[PDB]
Design a protein around this ligand. Structure first.
Ligand SMILES: *[C@@H]1O[C@H](CO)[C@@H](O[C@@H]2O[C@H](CO)[C@@H](O[C@@H]3O[C@H](CO[C@H]4O[C@H](CO)[C@@H](O)[C@H](O)[C@@H]4O)[C@@H](O)[C@H](O[C@H]4O[C@H](CO)[C@@H](O)[C@H](O)[C@@H]4O)[C@@H]3O)[C@H](O)[C@H]2NC(C)=O)[C@H](O)[C@H]1NC(C)=O
Ligand SMILES: *[C@@H]1O[C@H](CO)[C@@H](O[C@@H]2O[C@H](CO)[C@@H](O[C@@H]3O[C@H](CO[C@H]4O[C@H](CO)[C@@H](O)[C@H](O)[C@@H]4O)[C@@H](O)[C@H](O[C@H]4O[C@H](CO)[C@@H](O)[C@H](O)[C@@H]4O)[C@@H]3O)[C@H](O)[C@H]2NC(C)=O)[C@H](O)[C@H]1NC(C)=O
Ligand SMILES: *[C@@H]1O[C@H](CO)[C@@H](O[C@@H]2O[C@H](CO)[C@@H](O[C@@H]3O[C@H](CO[C@H]4O[C@H](CO)[C@@H](O)[C@H](O)[C@@H]4O)[C@@H](O)[C@H](O[C@H]4O[C@H](CO)[C@@H](O)[C@H](O)[C@@H]4O)[C@@H]3O)[C@H](O)[C@H]2NC(C)=O)[C@H](O)[C@H]1NC(C)=O
Ligand SMILES: *[C@@H]1O[C@H](CO)[C@@H](O[C@@H]2O[C@H](CO)[C@@H](O[C@@H]3O[C@H](CO[C@H]4O[C@H](CO)[C@@H](O)[C@H](O)[C@@H]4O)[C@@H](O)[C@H](O[C@H]4O[C@H](CO)[C@@H](O)[C@H](O)[C@@H]4O)[C@@H]3O)[C@H](O)[C@H]2NC(C)=O)[C@H](O)[C@H]1NC(C)=O
Ligand SMILES: *[C@@H]1O[C@H](CO)[C@@H](O[C@@H]2O[C@H](CO)[C@@H](O)[C@H](O)[C@H]2NC(C)=O)[C@H](O)[C@H]1NC(C)=O
Ligand SMILES: *[C@@H]1O[C@H](CO)[C@@H](O[C@@H]2O[C@H](CO)[C@@H](O)[C@H](O)[C@H]2NC(C)=O)[C@H](O)[C@H]1NC(C)=O
Ligand SMILES: *[C@@H]1O[C@H](CO)[C@@H](O[C@@H]2O[C@H](CO)[C@@H](O)[C@H](O)[C@H]2NC(C)=O)[C@H](O)[C@H]1NC(C)=O
Ligand SMILES: *[C@@H]1O[C@H](CO)[C@@H](O[C@@H]2O[C@H](CO)[C@@H](O)[C@H](O)[C@H]2NC(C)=O)[C@H](O)[C@H]1NC(C)=O
Ligand SMILES: CC(=O)N[C@H]1[C@H]([C@H](O)[C@H](O)CO)O[C@@](O)(C(=O)O)C[C@@H]1O
Ligand SMILES: CC(=O)N[C@H]1[C@H]([C@H](O)[C@H](O)CO)O[C@@](O)(C(=O)O)C[C@@H]1O
Ligand SMILES: CC(=O)N[C@H]1[C@H]([C@H](O)[C@H](O)CO)O[C@@](O)(C(=O)O)C[C@@H]1O
Ligand SMILES: CC(=O)N[C@H]1[C@H]([C@H](O)[C@H](O)CO)O[C@@](O)(C(=O)O)C[C@@H]1O
Ligand SMILES: OC[C@H]1O[C@H](O)[C@@H](O)[C@@H](O)[C@@H]1O
Ligand SMILES: OC[C@H]1O[C@H](O)[C@@H](O)[C@@H](O)[C@@H]1O
Ligand SMILES: OC[C@H]1O[C@H](O)[C@@H](O)[C@@H](O)[C@@H]1O
Ligand SMILES: OC[C@H]1O[C@H](O)[C@@H](O)[C@@H](O)[C@@H]1O
Ligand SMILES: [Ca+2]
Ligand SMILES: [Ca+2]
Ligand SMILES: [Ca+2]
Ligand SMILES: [Ca+2]
Lengths: 388, 388, 388, 388
């Protein structure tokens, strides 16, 4: 076993093909299945795993009531092979109401945050043992990616924020070797608010596309140099912007440097990645709600400020059905590194009042250089057939 | 780990001996078990797995209502070790409402088709990662074997059809190396309609027996040359024909070249294989319905047009009990390659109206050169004891 | 991986110490657990497994009604690591209403009998594939040990009977190499009726203690020579006899050569083994019913006709609680081969009428050369708290 | 695979960071989960496992009634990877109503005690086989640590007691090599009553902190020399004492040599360990009840009689919530040996009368040399939402 370096070119991308779906809410109506949110996917060199933050209960269970809240002492990070839904034999790998995980080629790192809002603890678990921990630096909900971290040559990097959800906060990038924090760098650059980064290897460094919860409906970019620990940041150039909420497609804009100040407050975790001067990106179909999910390429949308020339659109979830968070993960092939993404399909409160719980299922697609058709792969549960 | 070449002679066959049964419908009345259809079996060099297309729900679950339909965005391919029934810890390996899987000696290939009827996508997943995809070529339900594919020296082959279920369609044979499509050949020869092929290694090539849904109650044969990609096809010679529906044994016929035009419309997935000039084949016992299941040898039934001289009959499922699809898989022994088959035992709608769901169990037999007795191994559930 | 030869001396035995218990009936009242009977234990060189014949259903399930019957097409052999109760993820390794399994050092052999009473089939599965099969030789319930077989230097041996349960039958000993039957020898010697043998390695051969269902309440012995295939048989010498039913301890007898003709009809599977001239044996405490379970040594009870001098008694299950079958298995230690046994704890019909099902749990003890105390480890379920 | 020697220095400790939590009582209200008590954690060189003594039943099950009792023939030791809650696929590794387990670098040892109070048996199982057993030496509930044993260079040591819970008893330290007892030493030194020791490697020997159930609310220490089998004992010096019950912090005392005779009767399993002259220790927050849980360092609390100068306090479970037993386990890092602890969170009878059962969940923390914040991680079930 050798460390991963991810030193292959990005695969050619013509769009995305279906990869996995867990159907977990449909299963929850006839089976004991965990209540979750904030899912993601990350793969070791052989095979992929699905992860999510449990709510310390199954769905058909009195403890599923009022699971809309994001942070409790009962949330744990669940980890199963991809496509195995979160049944009662699922391993809870750490105590977490925010997390990130990744494999360095040799073993798994988990970054797990729990405890009081004003004084949380992050644990750093590597190859099955606690190696490091830190306390909150700004006393305002220390929190992290909710998707995979990225490791090159044994140095894993993860983005964390502590501070306001609606104003200037303190973001830092940690560099971790076999579980030990070896350096911490503050965020630098023109991104003004950074949360929930979706990061990917872009050898020789790591590139992240994030959520600006304050003034941007355009997504921040954070670039991380793992050799010298330097950080740069800005915003995706595309005038078709990636956050929710956002303005409509004719009114929206980005010019790469600053938050657009267009319905910038609040947001949703999402992703994008560059392909030469173009950008591939996903977003909800609704501009206001976490409903629908579409991907497309914006021609020159990485390099040219405010480009809106899209092509190669695919519907992942039709506009009539619920989506949620989405994130990137990367998979090493024989000759190239592929990009894949998952979509959280949130069901229950507050939007759906027939039940008292909040949970989700997942759907997952991977880049292809081949061809594909059309469809829609929503959660699929009938809210009226669920236990309350 | 080396690629499989299957370069051993076929084992001697005197008939078939019991191998596996999962009892899944009986278990579903007191346990959380997936709703399935279109099951099959395929083995890696060590051990066998059962697969089937899930319906995105367990049976005792409101979402099992009206699971008679064949294609939805919730169907996934399930994969367990053979004899482990589809419980909630079962892995969903891909999104699929049609599939085929096989192991090349090194890793698993899955061919998984999903999305809109008029514009489906097939994903090609190998060693746990998406390697290729194609879109529908004829915009009319791209679909595949619903049983194992076959790999020689690292080149796996799979038969797919796109086009009418009741007239000329477009069948193609794909050749796939570590998940990458390297060649596609159109069907050639005198088979006029080919679906749901049951294929087996017949070194140096692959031989398939299929379903003609249009004009044949005799089964098509497709022979695939993996070295030069050439294809030949025709029909099993036996006058005791393998499809359902079919005429009775005195009225039925085949003369090897053409569909017989005898109750040829519709059909069921099945199998046969040659043993010198003779053929071993399975079929439903009923000529009209998917009820009962029998195997026998037809003397000269591979080589002599319209031969009806049977011997070595075995009842697998008595005439009074339900069957379904059946397919072949092959298993490498010390000195020879054995042939085995499974039978899908379908329960529920439309035929049984006491319940609202449709699902199945499996029973599996393998070739023997020894001796054996008699019996009947049906699904065994009492429809009146099931959840509706 | 090398073949086992079992060429170490028997361990010193002072009695038996607790090893495993599964509590499966207690668990069945609050969990989905298989209905079973005829359990046993067998270990590969690393670890032990529990096996039993399923009844194709869980206990809290309408299909558990009238599971008293011994042979149906739904019975399968279940196999889990020892101490893991038969939950819904349990593997059904073959179709069987009679079975025997054993590991030769390299892989598992399963001998699985199913089908019609008058014309059964035995399948021989080795390293996960069907290698051989035979049909019934006497058309009267071909049947086998219901406990582990034994392999020396790659040759596994198993005892099977076909014929009357209440008169002369046809017993044969099969010799099987990597799943292939290489020789079959008829029973020879003075045992007059032999069923359900509990066999153990006694290098250079195999020694079995069995059930005489016809005229003996003393247990038969069958000795098997694996080099030349010769067979000898007789009866355990001990005047404290091992079957149920039997006469009381003052009236019972054995003189080593013949069935005692004392309450000889019917019987229960059990075991014994020699220790020099002495014998270690288990039996039910009741002389009429499968209730209680005790072990003891009979001084000179292997060599001296009708010896009744017992010592080192241990109660395993108190007289007030139900037992069932019991069998031997052997485990290789650093310097010696240990002997262990399991006891089936049968609950439900016909004896207990509060429920409609019949099932069992297990308890398991292993030889020790150390010391121990006293106790009683019965099934423990309260029949009045069970689903009917 | 080599034997562990634990010959690295203790890691620096600044306090403890969250490691694992299983949420098992919350899950039990909507899932089939074992009833347990007396849990602990122990790790092989790769990964950690959670263990506990089952009560032979799940919680939503009539057999969970009156599970307050500590010893029955149905209790077994359960073992899962850490964070996997005790679902129905959990392995019961031995019959036990008292236990200890540990891995020597090569394989697992389990010490399992069961049977009659006045004449119990301890089984010693190593690498999956029974290797040794002993009977009760004093006929008064032979019993052991209920947490991990410790092995150096292949010699594992375990502390056991037999005798009164409220007066002089007979404690012995056993030394076990690949499952075989090679030496037994009696307790020696000034500890007057020793139960439920929490032991850790302190190369070249083993150090334990225990429970005095007779006259001490200060905890005993037992030091074990694995080379010459000699034993020394005394009491933790800290005037902030570790048992429950105890006097308040101003009235309590210890002077290192003798039991303090302060609310000394009864007790709870707990732990402490030295860090130079200082001691790190956990205790319940309540002085009378098993409620709350806190850890802190007592400056000079290892070396200076009656020191009460605490620093670095952390709440693990707030004062308003239930705790239970707690124990130490040790984990080998790249350069140092870390200390971790678990807390049993007991729910149900006798204290909570809304239900008829008694069970627990777990929470687990590991030493850190980093930083951390604050929180509280209690069991979290709502007693009014549980099955009775
Ligand atoms: C079977 O499945 C395939 C694959 O999914 C479908 O093909 C895709 O079809 C979509 C929708 O048409 C294509 O994406 C769209 O591309 C447009 C740009 O391409 C056109 O214009 C350029 C420039 O002149 C031409 O070079 C090019 O050849 C095309 O003529 C974008 O304008 C589209 O965005 C606009 O419309 C969408 C709604 O469709 C809005 O949401 C946007 O806001 C915007 O107004 C869009 O991106 C995609 O490129 C095709 N893929 C491929 C690989 O061909 C088939 O349509 C489908 N067939 C059926 C019947 O289901
Ligand atoms: C115990 O189990 C064994 C093994 O399963 C059973 O033996 C099989 O029995 C079946 C049924 O008889 C045999 O299959 C049949 O073979 C017939 C041809 O063989 C006979 O005729 C030839 C030519 O003259 C002779 O050489 C040969 O020795 C036989 O005399 C076919 O004609 C049969 O097909 C016809 O009948 C079946 C119904 O049985 C119809 O469905 C068909 O449409 C057709 O009319 C059939 O194929 C089989 O070969 C035997 N196997 C072996 C290996 O011997 C035992 O019968 C069974 N005993 C009991 C009591 O259960
Ligand atoms: C704690 O646990 C230990 C270990 O389990 C118990 O010791 C065993 O006790 C049993 C019962 O006494 C012993 O088994 C019996 O051995 C008798 C023969 O030994 C005695 O006689 C000989 C010959 O004179 C002496 O050499 C020897 O020292 C003994 O004095 C048999 O006669 C017994 O069988 C008879 O009684 C039983 C009921 O007990 C009947 O069911 C039989 O039909 C028959 O009448 C019996 O086999 C056993 O040997 C002891 N084991 C060991 C290793 O010592 C302790 O008794 C137990 N203490 C308590 C209080 O629970
Ligand atoms: C965020 O989280 C951090 C880490 O958990 C919290 O910091 C810990 O805070 C606790 C409570 O104050 C500290 O533990 C306490 O240490 C006291 C000794 O230290 C003080 O006094 C010495 C000697 O003069 C000074 O050198 C030192 O700098 C400190 O000023 C003990 O006296 C305390 O025990 C007493 O109070 C507790 C209740 O707190 C009682 O239960 C005891 O009986 C006793 O009366 C206690 O041990 C701990 O050391 C801090 N950790 C670290 C690493 O700094 C932050 O407080 C928290 N912030 C918030 C707002 O949540
Ligand atoms: C669902 O959960 C809510 C939130 O905890 C429960 O409401 C709390 O109930 C407690 C116990 O009576 C009250 O003290 C709190 O004031 C309630 N909080 C709020 C916001 O209402 C509620 O009881 C639970 N059950 C249902 C059926 O709603
Ligand atoms: C079983 O499933 C059917 C098919 O989806 C359900 O029937 C549909 O119900 C919706 C919601 O009311 C209607 O809009 C559709 O028109 C119905 N379709 C048909 C074909 O009837 C049915 O409600 C489900 N439940 C039961 C008990 O039958
Ligand atoms: C329990 O199983 C028995 C045995 O199969 C069932 O009884 C059979 O019921 C069928 C269907 O009505 C009858 O044709 C058979 O004659 C019955 N056999 C006997 C021996 O009675 C019985 O119905 C099942 N259910 C219960 C509640 O007893
Ligand atoms: C809960 O368990 C208790 C303890 O076993 C049960 O009470 C026993 O019930 C038996 C059977 O009637 C009586 O002979 C015993 O005398 C009872 N013992 C005691 C201490 O009361 C009780 O029945 C069980 N069920 C419930 C609902 O309490
Ligand atoms: C609390 C926490 O750690 N993360 C939560 C974040 C933050 O509230 C925002 O990023 C603002 O900081 O967003 C969610 O609320 C959301 O939008 O669905 C869910 C997630 O659990
Ligand atoms: C829809 C699909 O992909 N395959 C389906 C096929 C096709 O309808 C036919 O082969 C005609 O094309 O047959 C089934 O309907 C059937 O007969 O039981 C089930 C299967 O799911
Ligand atoms: C039918 C079969 O294969 N074996 C059965 C045997 C035989 O009936 C006897 O050995 C007589 O032949 O005994 C049982 O009935 C029994 O006594 O509990 C159970 C077992 O399933
Ligand atoms: C019975 C047994 O083996 N151990 C039990 C011990 C002993 O009773 C005491 O240590 C006194 O000896 O403590 C418990 O009761 C307790 O306090 O919660 C539980 C545990 O099961
Ligand atoms: O942004 C609006 C717009 O999307 C794209 C364009 O090519 C238009 O045809 C469509 O109306
Ligand atoms: O096809 C009909 C036929 O099957 C075969 C024959 O050998 C007949 O005896 C039987 O009636
Ligand atoms: O067989 C009867 C008998 O068992 C033994 C003897 O040593 C007696 O004491 C007892 O009564
Ligand atoms: O033991 C009582 C005490 O705890 C510590 C001290 O430093 C005090 O301030 C507190 O009141
Ligand atoms: Ca925003
Ligand atoms: Ca047809
Ligand atoms: Ca008898
Ligand atoms: Ca005390």
């Amino acid at each position: 076993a050798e460390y991963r370096n991810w030193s292959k070119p990005q695969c050619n991308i013509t769009g995305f093909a279906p990869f996995s779906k867990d159907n977990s809410i449909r299963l929850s109506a006839g089976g004991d299945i965990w209540v979750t949110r904030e899912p993601y996917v990350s793969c070791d060199p052989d095979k992929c795993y699905q992860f999510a933050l449990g709510q310390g209960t199954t769905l058909n269970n009195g403890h599923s009531n009022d699971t809309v809240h994001d942070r409790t002492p009962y949330r744990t990070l669940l980890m199963n092979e991809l496509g195995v839904p979160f049944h009662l034999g699922t391993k809870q790998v750490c105590i977490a109401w925010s997390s990130s995980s990744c494999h360095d080629g040799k073993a798994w790192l988990h970054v797990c945050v729990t405890g009081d809002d004003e004084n949380a603890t992050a644990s750093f678990i590597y190859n099955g043992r606690l190696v490091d921990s830190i306390g909150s630096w700004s006393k305002k909900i220390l929190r992290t990616q909710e998707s995979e971290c990225v490791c090159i040559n044994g140095t894993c990097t993860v983005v964390m924020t502590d501070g306001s959800a609606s104003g200037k906060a303190d973001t830092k990038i940690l560099f971790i070797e076999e579980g030990k924090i070896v350096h911490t760098s503050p965020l630098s650059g023109s991104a003004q608010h950074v949360e929930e980064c979706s990061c990917y290897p872009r050898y020789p460094g790591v590139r992240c596309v994030c959520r600006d919860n304050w003034k941007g409906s355009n997504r921040p970019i954070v670039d991380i140099n793992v050799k010298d620990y330097s950080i740069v940041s800005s915003y995706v150039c595309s005038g078709l912007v990636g956050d929710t909420p956002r303005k409509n497609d004719s009114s929206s804009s980005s010019h790469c440097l600053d938050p657009n100040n267009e319905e910038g407050g609040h947001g949703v975790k999402g992703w994008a990645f560059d392909d030469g001067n173009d950008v591939w990106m996903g977003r909800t179909i609704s501009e206001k709600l976490r409903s629908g999910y579409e991907t497309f390429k914006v021609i020159e949308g990485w390099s040219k400020p405010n480009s809106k020339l899209q092509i190669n659109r695919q519907v992942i979830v039709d506009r009539g059905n619920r989506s949620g968070y989405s994130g990137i993960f990367s998979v090493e092939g024989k000759s190239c590194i592929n990009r894949c993404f998952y979509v959280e399909l949130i069901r229950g409160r507050k939007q759906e009042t027939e039940v008292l719980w909040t949970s989700n299922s997942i759907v997952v697609f991977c880049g292809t250089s081949g061809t594909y058709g059309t469809g829609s792969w929503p959660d699929g549960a009938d809210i009226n057939l669920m236990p309350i």
